[PDB]
Amino acid sequence: GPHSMRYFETAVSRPGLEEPRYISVGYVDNKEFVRFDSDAENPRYEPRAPWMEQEGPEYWERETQKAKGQEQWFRVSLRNLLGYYNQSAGGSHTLQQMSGCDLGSDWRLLRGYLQFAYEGRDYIALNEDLKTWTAADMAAQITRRKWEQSGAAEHYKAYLEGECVEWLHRYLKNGNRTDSPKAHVTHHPREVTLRCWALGFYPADITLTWQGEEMELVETRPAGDGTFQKWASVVVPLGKEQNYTCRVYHEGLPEPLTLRWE
């Protein structure tokens, strides 16, 4: 099937705090595999999956040193943004970045990603063409023009098509499953409530329906054990239980599960 790599990076300023806290987290197929936190005693990228311990000391030295470079980057950019938005000293501020690559099942590059947010809101993103930028805000135009004049896009493109694809290939060999949902319905004395539960599944993505014709739900939640939970409920007249069926749709299923109150 398809594959992906992402790095999610955060820098956070607070009022007194001399310097900002920088965190970088790396994901391969949405599972965390490396992490760097400048708050740590010895700040460095650590393996986050046993299959990463196999990387030599060159890996950890080069990656750790890159992260220190990012910390500074985020530090300087955090200063610039303050000025761009005519913000003053005394506030808390956040700068975020997502970057990485999507591969198809053939392992070819489907899509590069490079996006940034300031105060949790879209700031500037590299378009899918990997050549042009989108930047909504007026303040963002100082950066867009700066980055057009500097040819940054070409350099982000080179990383996205080269190094990102290349090391994901490597990681995927070193890292060598969907857990299906077990479903069941519960009964609660609302006129009664039918609650279709879904449990033990991975990945989180899932749909639950209630029926004949096409309801309360909860957001998908982690069990804490790597797997996910969800439920969905409807209010139903008494005795009229069997007239209602729940369908669960998940990628790990051979076909959608069908259930009723039993």
Partner: peptide
């Protein structure tokens, strides 16, 4: 491997 950004904002 992580990207190392280019020009600052």
């Amino acid at each position: 491997k992580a990207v190392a950004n280019f020009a600052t904002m």
